[PDB]
Coordinates of C-alpha atoms and ligand atoms in Angstrom, one line a residue:
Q1 CA 215.4 60.6 103.7
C2 CA 212.4 59.5 102.2
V3 CA 209.7 56.5 103.2
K4 CA 208.5 53.9 100.4
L5 CA 204.8 54.5 99.8
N6 CA 202.7 51.2 99.3
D7 CA 202.8 51.8 95.5
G8 CA 206.6 52.3 95.2
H9 CA 207.4 55.8 95.3
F10 CA 209.0 57.7 97.8
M11 CA 207.6 60.5 100.3
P12 CA 210.3 62.6 101.6
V13 CA 209.8 62.2 105.7
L14 CA 209.8 65.9 106.3
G15 CA 206.9 67.9 104.5
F16 CA 206.4 71.6 104.1
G17 CA 202.8 72.9 105.4
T18 CA 201.6 75.7 103.2
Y19 CA 198.5 77.0 104.6
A20 CA 198.1 80.6 105.5
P21 CA 194.9 82.1 106.8
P22 CA 193.8 85.0 104.2
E23 CA 195.1 87.7 106.2
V24 CA 198.4 86.9 104.9
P25 CA 199.0 88.0 101.4
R26 CA 198.8 85.3 98.6
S27 CA 202.8 86.6 97.6
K28 CA 203.5 85.2 101.0
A29 CA 203.8 81.5 99.8
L30 CA 205.8 82.5 96.7
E31 CA 208.5 83.8 98.5
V32 CA 208.3 81.1 101.8
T33 CA 207.9 77.9 99.8
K34 CA 211.1 79.0 97.7
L35 CA 213.2 79.5 100.9
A36 CA 211.6 76.0 102.4
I37 CA 213.2 74.4 98.9
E38 CA 216.3 76.8 99.7
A39 CA 216.5 75.1 103.6
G40 CA 216.4 71.5 102.1
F41 CA 212.5 71.0 102.5
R42 CA 211.5 68.5 99.1
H43 CA 207.9 67.7 100.1
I44 CA 205.5 70.4 99.8
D45 CA 202.2 70.2 101.0
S46 CA 199.0 72.3 99.5
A47 CA 195.4 72.2 98.6
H48 CA 192.7 73.5 96.6
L49 CA 191.8 74.9 100.0
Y50 CA 194.4 76.8 100.5
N51 CA 194.1 79.2 97.9
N52 CA 198.0 79.6 97.6
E53 CA 198.4 76.8 94.3
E54 CA 199.5 79.3 92.0
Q55 CA 202.1 80.6 94.3
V56 CA 203.4 76.9 95.6
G57 CA 204.0 76.1 92.0
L58 CA 205.8 78.8 90.9
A59 CA 208.0 78.7 93.9
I60 CA 208.6 75.2 92.6
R61 CA 208.8 76.3 88.9
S62 CA 211.2 78.6 90.0
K63 CA 213.3 76.5 91.9
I64 CA 213.3 74.2 89.1
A65 CA 214.3 77.3 86.5
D66 CA 217.2 78.0 88.7
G67 CA 218.7 75.1 88.5
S68 CA 218.2 74.0 92.4
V69 CA 216.1 71.0 92.3
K70 CA 214.3 69.0 89.3
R71 CA 210.9 67.8 88.9
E72 CA 211.4 64.7 90.1
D73 CA 213.3 66.0 94.0
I74 CA 210.1 67.6 94.6
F75 CA 207.2 65.8 96.3
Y76 CA 204.1 68.1 95.5
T77 CA 200.6 67.2 97.3
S78 CA 197.5 68.8 96.8
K79 CA 194.1 68.0 98.4
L80 CA 190.5 67.3 96.5
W81 CA 188.3 69.5 98.6
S82 CA 185.0 68.4 100.1
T83 CA 182.6 70.0 97.7
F84 CA 184.2 67.9 95.2
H85 CA 183.4 64.4 96.3
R86 CA 180.8 63.4 93.4
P87 CA 183.3 61.2 91.5
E88 CA 182.4 63.1 88.1
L89 CA 183.7 66.1 89.9
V90 CA 187.2 64.3 90.9
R91 CA 189.1 64.6 88.2
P92 CA 188.4 68.1 87.3
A93 CA 188.9 69.4 90.8
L94 CA 192.4 67.8 90.5
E95 CA 192.9 68.8 86.4
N96 CA 192.0 72.5 88.3
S97 CA 194.8 71.8 90.9
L98 CA 197.4 71.5 88.2
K99 CA 196.6 74.3 86.1
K100 CA 196.8 76.8 88.7
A101 CA 200.2 75.3 90.1
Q102 CA 201.2 74.9 86.1
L103 CA 202.2 71.2 87.0
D104 CA 202.1 68.2 84.6
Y105 CA 201.4 66.0 88.0
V106 CA 200.9 66.3 91.5
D107 CA 202.7 63.4 93.8
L108 CA 200.3 63.0 96.0
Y109 CA 196.5 63.6 95.8
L110 CA 194.3 63.1 98.9
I111 CA 190.7 63.0 99.9
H112 CA 191.0 66.2 102.2
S113 CA 188.2 65.1 104.5
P114 CA 185.5 62.5 104.6
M115 CA 182.8 65.1 105.5
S116 CA 180.8 65.9 102.1
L117 CA 179.6 69.4 101.5
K118 CA 177.1 70.4 98.9
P119 CA 178.9 70.9 95.2
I120 CA 175.1 72.5 104.1
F121 CA 176.4 68.8 104.2
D122 CA 176.2 66.2 101.3
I123 CA 176.0 62.1 101.1
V124 CA 178.6 60.7 99.0
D125 CA 179.7 57.4 98.9
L126 CA 183.2 57.8 99.5
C127 CA 184.1 54.1 97.9
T128 CA 182.8 56.0 94.5
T129 CA 185.3 59.1 95.1
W130 CA 187.8 56.6 95.5
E131 CA 187.3 55.0 92.6
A132 CA 187.6 58.3 90.8
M133 CA 190.9 58.9 92.3
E134 CA 192.2 55.4 91.5
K135 CA 191.7 56.7 87.8
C136 CA 193.3 60.0 88.4
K137 CA 196.6 57.8 89.2
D138 CA 196.1 55.5 86.3
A139 CA 195.9 58.8 84.0
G140 CA 199.0 59.9 85.6
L141 CA 197.5 63.1 86.9
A142 CA 198.1 61.7 91.0
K143 CA 201.8 59.5 91.5
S144 CA 199.6 58.5 94.2
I145 CA 196.5 59.0 96.0
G146 CA 195.7 59.1 99.7
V147 CA 193.2 60.5 102.3
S148 CA 193.3 63.0 104.9
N149 CA 191.1 63.1 108.1
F150 CA 190.0 59.6 108.0
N151 CA 189.4 57.7 111.2
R152 CA 189.9 53.8 110.9
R153 CA 186.2 52.4 110.3
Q154 CA 186.9 55.2 107.4
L155 CA 189.9 53.9 106.4
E156 CA 188.8 50.2 106.3
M157 CA 185.8 51.2 104.2
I158 CA 188.1 51.8 101.7
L159 CA 190.6 48.5 102.2
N160 CA 187.5 46.7 102.0
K161 CA 185.8 47.9 98.8
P162 CA 185.1 45.5 95.9
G163 CA 187.4 45.5 93.3
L164 CA 190.0 47.9 95.1
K165 CA 192.8 48.7 92.8
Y166 CA 195.1 51.4 95.0
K167 CA 195.2 51.3 98.4
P168 CA 195.7 54.8 100.2
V169 CA 199.2 55.2 100.3
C170 CA 198.7 57.7 103.6
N171 CA 195.9 58.9 105.7
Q172 CA 197.3 62.7 106.8
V173 CA 195.6 63.7 110.1
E174 CA 195.8 66.1 113.3
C175 CA 198.9 64.3 115.1
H176 CA 201.2 66.1 117.8
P177 CA 201.8 65.1 121.7
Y178 CA 198.5 66.4 122.7
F179 CA 196.6 64.0 120.5
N180 CA 199.5 61.4 119.3
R181 CA 196.7 59.0 117.5
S182 CA 199.1 56.0 118.3
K183 CA 196.0 53.2 117.9
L184 CA 195.0 54.6 114.3
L185 CA 199.2 55.0 113.9
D186 CA 199.5 51.1 114.6
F187 CA 196.5 50.5 112.6
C188 CA 198.0 51.8 109.6
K189 CA 201.8 50.7 110.1
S190 CA 199.7 46.9 109.9
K191 CA 198.3 47.9 106.3
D192 CA 201.4 49.5 104.9
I193 CA 200.0 52.9 104.9
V194 CA 201.7 56.2 106.4
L195 CA 200.1 58.6 109.1
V196 CA 201.4 61.8 108.0
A197 CA 200.8 64.2 110.9
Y198 CA 200.0 67.7 110.5
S199 CA 199.5 70.6 113.0
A200 CA 202.4 68.6 114.3
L201 CA 203.6 72.2 116.1
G202 CA 200.1 72.5 117.4
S203 CA 198.0 74.1 114.8
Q204 CA 198.3 78.1 113.8
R205 CA 195.6 78.4 116.3
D206 CA 193.0 79.8 114.0
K207 CA 190.1 81.7 115.8
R208 CA 188.0 80.3 113.5
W209 CA 188.0 76.7 114.7
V210 CA 190.4 76.3 117.8
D211 CA 189.5 77.2 121.3
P212 CA 192.2 80.2 122.4
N213 CA 192.0 78.6 125.6
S214 CA 193.5 75.5 124.5
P215 CA 197.1 74.6 126.0
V216 CA 199.9 76.1 123.8
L217 CA 202.0 72.8 122.8
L218 CA 205.2 74.6 122.2
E219 CA 205.0 75.8 125.7
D220 CA 204.9 72.3 127.0
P221 CA 207.0 72.2 130.0
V222 CA 207.8 68.2 129.1
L223 CA 208.8 69.8 125.6
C224 CA 210.5 72.4 126.7
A225 CA 212.6 70.6 129.4
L226 CA 213.6 68.0 126.1
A227 CA 214.2 70.8 124.0
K228 CA 217.0 72.0 127.1
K229 CA 217.9 68.7 127.3
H230 CA 219.0 68.1 123.5
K231 CA 220.2 72.0 123.3
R232 CA 217.3 72.1 120.4
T233 CA 213.6 73.8 120.6
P234 CA 210.4 72.5 121.4
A235 CA 209.3 72.6 118.0
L236 CA 212.4 70.2 117.1
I237 CA 211.3 67.9 119.6
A238 CA 208.3 67.3 118.5
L239 CA 209.0 66.6 114.8
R240 CA 212.1 64.1 115.8
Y241 CA 208.8 62.7 117.8
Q242 CA 207.1 61.5 114.6
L243 CA 210.1 60.5 112.9
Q244 CA 211.0 58.2 115.4
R245 CA 207.4 56.9 115.5
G246 CA 207.8 56.5 111.9
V247 CA 205.3 59.4 110.7
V248 CA 205.8 61.5 108.5
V249 CA 205.8 64.9 109.8
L250 CA 205.0 68.3 108.5
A251 CA 205.7 71.7 109.5
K252 CA 204.2 75.1 108.5
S253 CA 206.3 78.3 108.8
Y254 CA 206.3 81.9 107.1
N255 CA 209.5 82.9 109.4
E256 CA 212.9 82.6 107.6
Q257 CA 214.5 81.5 110.8
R258 CA 212.0 79.1 112.2
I259 CA 211.8 77.1 108.5
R260 CA 216.0 76.6 108.3
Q261 CA 215.8 75.6 112.1
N262 CA 212.7 73.0 111.1
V263 CA 215.2 70.9 109.0
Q264 CA 217.9 70.1 111.8
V265 CA 215.0 67.5 113.0
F266 CA 217.4 65.4 110.7
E267 CA 220.5 66.2 113.3
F268 CA 219.9 64.6 116.6
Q269 CA 217.7 61.6 118.5
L270 CA 215.6 61.4 121.3
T271 CA 216.0 58.4 123.7
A272 CA 213.6 55.5 124.7
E273 CA 213.2 57.8 128.1
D274 CA 212.5 60.9 125.8
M275 CA 210.0 59.5 123.6
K276 CA 208.1 58.1 126.7
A277 CA 207.7 61.3 128.2
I278 CA 206.4 62.7 125.1
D279 CA 204.1 59.6 125.0
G280 CA 202.6 60.7 128.6
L281 CA 201.3 63.8 127.2
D282 CA 199.0 62.5 125.3
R283 CA 195.3 63.9 126.1
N284 CA 193.0 63.6 123.6
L285 CA 193.0 67.1 122.1
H286 CA 192.6 68.1 118.7
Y287 CA 192.8 71.8 118.3
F288 CA 190.3 71.9 115.3
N289 CA 187.2 71.5 117.4
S290 CA 184.4 73.7 116.3
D291 CA 181.0 72.9 115.4
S292 CA 181.4 73.3 111.8
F293 CA 182.9 69.7 111.5
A294 CA 182.0 68.1 114.6
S295 CA 178.2 68.2 114.1
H296 CA 178.9 66.5 110.5
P297 CA 177.4 63.1 110.0
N298 CA 181.0 61.5 109.0
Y299 CA 182.9 64.0 111.6
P300 CA 186.0 61.3 111.8
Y301 CA 186.5 62.2 116.1
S302 CA 182.8 60.6 117.0
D303 CA 185.1 57.3 116.5
Ligands
NAP1 N1 194.6 67.9 106.5 C1 194.3 68.8 106.3 O1 193.3 68.8 106.7 C2 195.5 69.5 107.4 C3 195.1 70.5 108.6 C4 195.8 71.5 109.0 C5 197.2 71.6 108.4 N2 197.3 70.8 107.4 C6 198.7 71.2 106.7 O2 199.9 70.5 107.8 C7 200.3 72.0 107.6 C8 200.9 72.0 109.1 O3 200.2 72.6 110.0 P1 199.8 73.6 110.5 O4 199.6 75.1 110.0 O5 198.5 73.6 111.8 O6 200.9 74.4 111.7 P2 202.1 73.4 112.6 O7 203.2 73.1 111.4 O8 201.1 72.9 113.3 O9 202.6 75.0 112.9 C9 201.9 75.9 114.1 C10 202.9 77.1 114.0 O10 204.2 76.7 114.6 C11 205.3 77.6 113.9 N3 206.6 77.0 114.0 C12 207.1 76.5 112.9 N4 208.3 76.4 113.2 C13 208.4 77.0 114.5 C14 209.5 76.5 114.6 N5 210.8 75.8 115.0 N6 209.6 77.2 116.6 C15 208.5 77.7 117.0 N7 207.5 78.0 116.1 C16 207.3 77.3 115.1 C17 204.6 78.4 112.6 O11 204.8 79.8 113.0 P3 205.6 80.6 112.3 O12 204.6 80.6 110.9 O13 205.7 81.8 113.0 O14 207.0 80.3 112.2 C18 203.2 77.8 112.6 O15 202.5 78.8 112.5 C19 199.4 73.1 107.0 O16 200.2 74.4 106.8 C20 198.8 72.4 106.1 O17 199.7 72.3 105.0 C21 196.4 69.6 106.7
FLR2 C1 191.5 74.6 107.0 C2 191.8 72.6 106.6 C3 193.3 72.7 106.4 O1 193.4 71.6 105.9 O2 193.9 73.0 107.1 C4 190.9 71.6 107.2 C5 191.6 71.6 109.1 C6 190.8 70.8 109.7 C7 190.1 70.0 109.1 C8 189.3 68.8 109.8 C9 188.9 67.5 109.6 C10 188.3 66.6 110.4 C11 188.5 67.1 112.0 C12 188.2 68.0 112.0 C13 188.8 69.3 111.2 C14 189.5 69.8 107.8 F1 188.7 69.3 106.9 C15 189.9 71.1 106.8

């Protein structure tokens, strides 16, 4: 199923994560995106950053072309990279993502991160970036617009902007049982903004940004006990947890069997005791923990 966004469009509550590191050949994104759609994923998350928008759009068009789905059955997200915060760079970056993907519109365009970079940090008034996003929604380039990696104060800056035309429909953030963001989630719910979770399965643990010492989420003994209790898997427990808290959850897999397994999140429910045991895992652990983010003036985790 789908959640209704605050602009009246619908987002499917489970989404396919498309990112793979650059060691993975570009052609893989094509193959696995088609498999994700075949498995029942209708929400596909990409970005200018990911260098895979041609393949992901090609996957989508191919599944349209063979009659599996119509365009209006797919919810496609791209994101504005942080070298393109200056308001006059916003629509051309979106236009560029649309031409890579060969689509007429994205369902969702996000400010990828509040941490502006030189078009080396930049200083940009994100409210002007937001005004340029709104113009992209008015032109029909994006059906919905939203942000990513914003903390509460950063989100308030936008909600509080004079002359605001469109609220962000979502804030896409790192969110999983080690870092469950419950206070940010309550704030988003009170403003009718959807929290979308990435690294919901504990991230790809990429050496550039993630400490290899950090606990592996899917090896977590409480998730493992819960998987055994429900005869599911630690992944499926982690996804199901997000759905039950009203969070839209992404899931990356480039593996045929795991892609097919992940759509089982719809087949069972956790109980209130299960959810409390999962809530007890919260330990302020964002897997992305690198000097290259944390030294930035608008790093969101400084609070
Ligand atoms: N907005 C942002 O700044 C931001 C940041 C990070 C990610 N994202 C988006 O969120 C998406 C998902 O997050 P993520 O890439 O960090 O990965 P994730 O969904 O946390 O996945 C972690 C690993 O879980 C494995 N996995 C998937 N299903 C599994 C299963 N059923 N059992 C065991 N392992 C399973 C995958 O390995 P295999 O491929 O081997 O199955 C995957 O590499 C990204 O692809 C991207 O679209 C956005
Ligand atoms: C690599 C890229 C992504 O979308 O995967 C990414 C991941 C994490 C972040 C991020 C954003 C804020 C704090 C720490 C990390 C990002 F800005 C971009």
